[PDB]
Design a protein around this ligand. Sequence first.
Ligand SMILES: O=C(N[C@@H]1[C@@H](O)[C@@H](O)[C@@H](CO)O[C@H]1O)C(F)F
Length: 576
Amino acid sequence: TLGASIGSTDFHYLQKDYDEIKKLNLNTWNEVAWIGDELNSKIVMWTNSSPVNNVTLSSSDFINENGDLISSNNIKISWLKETLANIGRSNPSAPLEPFPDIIHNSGSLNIEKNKIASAWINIKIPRNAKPGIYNGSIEVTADELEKSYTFDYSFEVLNLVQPLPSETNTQIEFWQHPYTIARYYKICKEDLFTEKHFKYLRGNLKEYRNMGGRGVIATIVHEAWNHQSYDSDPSMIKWRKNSYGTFEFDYSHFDKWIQLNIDLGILDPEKGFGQIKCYSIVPWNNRIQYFNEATNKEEAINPTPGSDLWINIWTQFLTSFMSHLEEKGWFNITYISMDERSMDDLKACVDLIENITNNSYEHFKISSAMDYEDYSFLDRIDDISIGLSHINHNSDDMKNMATHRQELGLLTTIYTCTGDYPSSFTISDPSEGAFTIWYSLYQNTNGFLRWSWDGWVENPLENVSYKYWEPGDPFLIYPAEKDSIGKTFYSTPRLEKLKEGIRDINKAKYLMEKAPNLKNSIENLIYSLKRPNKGENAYGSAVAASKEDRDLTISEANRIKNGINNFAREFISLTM
Ligand SMILES: O=C(N[C@@H]1[C@@H](O)[C@@H](O)[C@@H](CO)O[C@H]1O)C(F)F
């Protein structure tokens, strides 16, 4: 009636693989955690000819050798919900297949005949948990099921404390799209950035904060990315050309958005913690749009970057914006940002921003993300992000540039997007994200940027397909059901793997400071990282170059994590 086994969180259990999945029989799991850490696992279940109703998974408490308790309340077991994804990229003919990308709800599930269904297991180790080897069990029952399943779980909690994100130097930046969340939840224009809107922003922003999120995107012009996404990108700063004929700037949305992020502890502008990333002085395809009171219509202009028109406009804005930010106590964390723009384009922004100054001797910090590989010029950009496919693994150019930038107190990250492998798509193996984070440390960068926190298509919970990109590329979280009372978002295996990677690179860095006698050995481990090459599937999506490369991504991420935890054991053995 019902089959069950522990499954890996590294990859998806797909319906198409029913025949193979049916063969699984793993009944134990063990892992290593620090105090304040989290672990993940998964149970995969399958039906045969009969449907099975009221399938439930229940956790025992977790008990260490001393009898100390980690309550079953710290263990959340959530069904993985499938959604439909076109498996291609810009390929409407590609197969539309289901993927268990959504960490959905706890409680009971009815499963139809001849089906795979899996449940994600999230284990939180309290920040005051006692060290030790903790044992517990997860039981699977269902109405029809004669013999229930009990799976035996253990985890060792090492006597070291997982760093708080504030206590690390990890840089994490995921682009938020609060007007997309408004659209999905039918928040009207009149209620934008009111508590009615915040209802649906607060919880996912706390999720972002809690995993290490520091960067906060804000749009400063209309349609900065030329409406590449399903949803428009409105400006948080409204532009009007008035009756006399001058430009006015309405900062209301900007202010309410930023203050929210301050209130939640993502930004701290007095303290220079976090970033405000203002996109952009170079909108994609150059259009600057504004409401002209004469002629009363919306209007636009196409100035190419650098010109006198361009200089004066952005001067104007940057001037107002400066004063505006000085008013707030915010100016020190504000970056003017550019997304994959020309080298010649960047030239201008550095020059114009050079000029706009205040009586205090202060300057607008600058940010650029590049889809392309002498620091004279780049040193004038305070935060740069380089795409993974543009990092040559067989050169030290990246690592040397990032080492240099760090010496100057500048920011450097890596990003992934459409066409990358490893990456963070619905179709990706979730372990690819943990690899991605490790790779940011291998290249000696500050961390990881991704354009895609919450860029929902129409109804992600049922279909994720979009005209462009691999499926799921624009969002790392799902919305909740539209009418939901309570829940406002759901996480994903791929997001949980990015979280894991972040925790673990934070471990490595903590250990290299705490254990000088082990630092070189830790570094040797980190710099042993192998890199899979990329290929494409038949439908245009990036994938591993081969089965061997695909398996390498997974094995490497595990090898490094386990290495670091075994070094932690050695240091603990030392300082006892
Ligand atoms: O991710 C970035 N840029 C673009 C995005 O704006 C979007 O086009 C994305 C689609 O996967 O491709 C990224 O390269 C960022 F690195 F600047």
